[PDB]
Structure 1
């Protein structure tokens, strides 16, 4: 690797160095690849809930000139249409699905490019799981500030484990995301200010996405 990574113990002293080496998008297309990967994500996340009534859903037509003036909806000699108030909506939204597709390998590429950009931030950690027994948020934040994470700026903890105490201890900070590999999004990696890995985690990422 072209850069080391600091490994800090639970106190915050630097114990070691690691290397996270991934498949990177060629320099030209990176911004496109990632971009696309992101767009796709956000677009599949979308639920078309916007619904209208077409000209034929609208209640209570009959085909005829109106016999008497409906104040605001029509006048005396007029024909039924979309062009009234209360008329159908021409080309209005119907419930959709926005779901598009992207190649698996392209996906993974975006993920890798993202995380391989984020190596100017990232730490590693000595796998703190045991130091939490009773869930304590106060404690988690203590630990954070020891590692130099401002409990403001939106950081990402990528671990293998969800140890219940840790899981709950982090639940209520708005700026943390605690990710298993089961939930790992391009989105959150892009979104995070600081990246945090464990040893097992680096071992995982450097394998799945390893450059040959």
Structure 2
């Protein structure tokens, strides 16, 4: 396809964006999502085994000559009060994936995200103070809608535009620093800058 543009509210469509996805492997994007989700997960689920428990290390009653079944400890993993046999422990979940597989995964979701995608021309010279009002006005100009979800790819992120953008929850401003695979799936409408197209078209083509 070919993408659209917006000077400041009016179209003049040009830049094309070439990028390399696979063919019969959406599975690559799935894997790249799953890895992302796993490595993040904090993993703070902690239980005590029968060793670690605060409890008496002693036979309560003798082995023979009572009708009771032979007991080892009272903090045993069959009584309530101390046990938890194969219980979770403070455990890391960080799995590897290759470099090129991650990069390819990032490329494929973006490649399939053009269609919904969008581009603008620089607009950092508008905002002198930080203003959310003007920002939302510019959203409704472009027609991105405070209801729907959006991801602003912005090659060089400016202070005043970032601060105005912060408190819109549905919105999500991203440098190439904090580029994310989860997010490019998260968004309904992507919205690039001319520099961004040069970056992605160069780096992933």
Please give the TM-score of this superposition, normalised by the length of structure 2.
0.86
Deviations 1:145-188 (A, max 9, x none): 00011111110100112211100000000011100000000000
> Per the alignment, do residues 185 and 20 of structure 1 end up closer, same or farther by CA in structure 2, a change over 3 Å counting?
farther
> Per the alignment, do residues 10 and 146 of structure 1 end up closer, same or farther by CA in structure 2, a change over 3 Å counting?
farther
Q: Give distance in 2, aligned partners of 1:98 and 1:117.
A: 29
Q: Give distance in 1, aligned partners of 2:175 and 2:29.
A: 21
Deviations 1:12-53 (A, max 9, x none): 677666676677666543310000000000000101100000
Alignment match of 1:131 (pick from 126, 130, 133)? 126
1:7–1:124 CA contact under 8 A, matched in 2 = no
1:123–1:195 CA contact under 8 A, matched in 2 = yes
| DSSP 3-state at the match of 1:157 | strand
> Per the alignment, do residues 162 and 111 of structure 1 end up closer, same or farther by CA in structure 2, a change over 3 Å counting?
same
* Bigger strand fraction: 1
2:21–2:107 CA contact under 8 A, matched in 1 = no
> Per the alignment, do residues 38 and 8 of structure 1 end up closer, same or farther by CA in structure 2, a change over 3 Å counting?
closer
Aligned residues: 205
Root mean square deviation, CA, Å: 4.3
1:8–1:15 CA contact under 8 A, matched in 2 = no
Q: Give distance in 2, aligned partners of 1:151 and 1:190.
A: 18
Q: Give distance in 2, aligned partners of 1:19 and 1:114.
A: 21
> Per the alignment, do residues 105 and 64 of structure 1 end up closer, same or farther by CA in structure 2, a change over 3 Å counting?
same
Q: Give distance in 1, aligned partners of 2:130 and 2:68.
A: 63
1:57–1:88 CA contact under 8 A, matched in 2 = no
Q: Give distance in 2, aligned partners of 1:9 and 1:176.
A: 20
In structure 1, the gaps of 5 or more residues are 1-5
